[PDB]
Structure formats: C-alpha cells, structure tokens
Design a binder for this molecule. Structure first.
Ligand code: HEM
Length: 137
C-alpha cells in the first residue's frame, strides 16, 4: 500500500527521484523552463550534474516526509504551506503540481511494480487542494 510505497521509494531514493522527475519533464517538456540549468541536457548529462542529483533527492525526500505525515493520503496543511511559501515555488500554480502528480502516477502504473497508484493519485489531489487553500493560484 501507500506506506510500503514510501519505503520502496526511500530505499532507493536517488533512482526513483531521478526517474520520476525525468518522467515529469518528458511528459510535460514545457515544465523544463522552470529549471533553467537542465535546459538542453540529456538524461546522462543531468545525471552527471551533482546539482541535478541533489535537487531530485531533496524534492523526493520532502515529498516522502509529507506523504508519511499524511493520514489516509490527506497531507498536513502545514506541509502544503511549506511548499507554497518556498521562494523556489513562488511563480507556480496548482497546475504545475497536478502535472507532477499525473506523471508520477503514470510512472507507477508503467513500472510493472505493485505501487498503490490510486493512493498516490488521491494524495496528489488532496495536496493540490491544500496548496490552493494555502494561497497558491
Ligand atoms: C510535491 C512536489 C514538490 C516538492 C516536494 C518540491 C520540493 C522542492 C524542494 C525540497 C526544493 C529545494 C531543493 C534544493 O534546495 O536542492 C525545490 C526546488 C525547486 N522546485 Fe520544487 N517541489 C515540488 C514540485 C515542484 C514543481 C511542480 C515545480 C515546477 C514545475 C517545482 C519547481 C522547483 C524549482 C524551479 C526549484 C528550484 C530548482 C533549482 O534550484 O534549480 N517544484 N522543490
């Protein structure tokens, strides 16, 4: 279930973080413009940049802590507010996060592993709800 999926991802956070982030950018290439240093870079060039690895690891570590603090896939309002108030997210809208979650759930369904994809979809929906309540446009 969702708890085990958190353990799966955390066990190999590097690999899942890089693979899901790349899935997101591949599915929604226009999103790459927010990441000015990843423009024009192959997947291996990205994996060569210590800074890409560090970014993805920190994003997915935070995502897993938010997921783990959720109850029944309902995140804490305080965690949504962290995400809204981060300077790195200041021009984003909830549609950016929706797309992130569509890509993550599609990755899980395509992986041929037994992720609880329905629960990640619901967590994403509830997180998007919470982001909007905490002031994201
Ligand atoms: C729930 C999903 C997300 C989480 C948990 C998250 C978390 C984070 C964290 C922890 C950082 C800072 C990492 C560091 O200091 O190395 C970060 C940076 C950033 N995030 Fe997010 N983020 C999420 C979704 C998004 C989305 C959807 C976008 C845009 C489409 C985005 C754009 C950025 C940008 C541009 C940075 C700064 C990147 C850089 O330094 O090159 N984030 N995010």
């Amino acid at each position: 279930g969702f708890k085990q999926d958190i353990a799966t991802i955390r066990g190999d956070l590097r690999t899942y973080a890089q693979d899901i982030f790349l899935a997101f950018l591949n599915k929604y290439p226009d999103e790459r413009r927010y990441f000015k240093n990843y423009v024009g870079k192959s997947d291996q060039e990205l994996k060569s940049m210590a800074k890409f690895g560090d970014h993805t690891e920190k994003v997915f570590n935070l995502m897993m802590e938010v997921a783990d603090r959720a109850t029944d896939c309902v995140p804490l309002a305080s965690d949504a507010n962290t995400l809204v108030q981060m300077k790195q997210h200041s021009s984003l809208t909830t549609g950016n996060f929706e797309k992130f979650f569509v890509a993550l759930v599609e990755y899980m369904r395509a992986s041929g592993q037994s992720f609880d994809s329905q629960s990640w979809d619901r967590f994403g929906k509830n997180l998007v709800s919470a982001l909007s309540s905490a002031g994201m446009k």
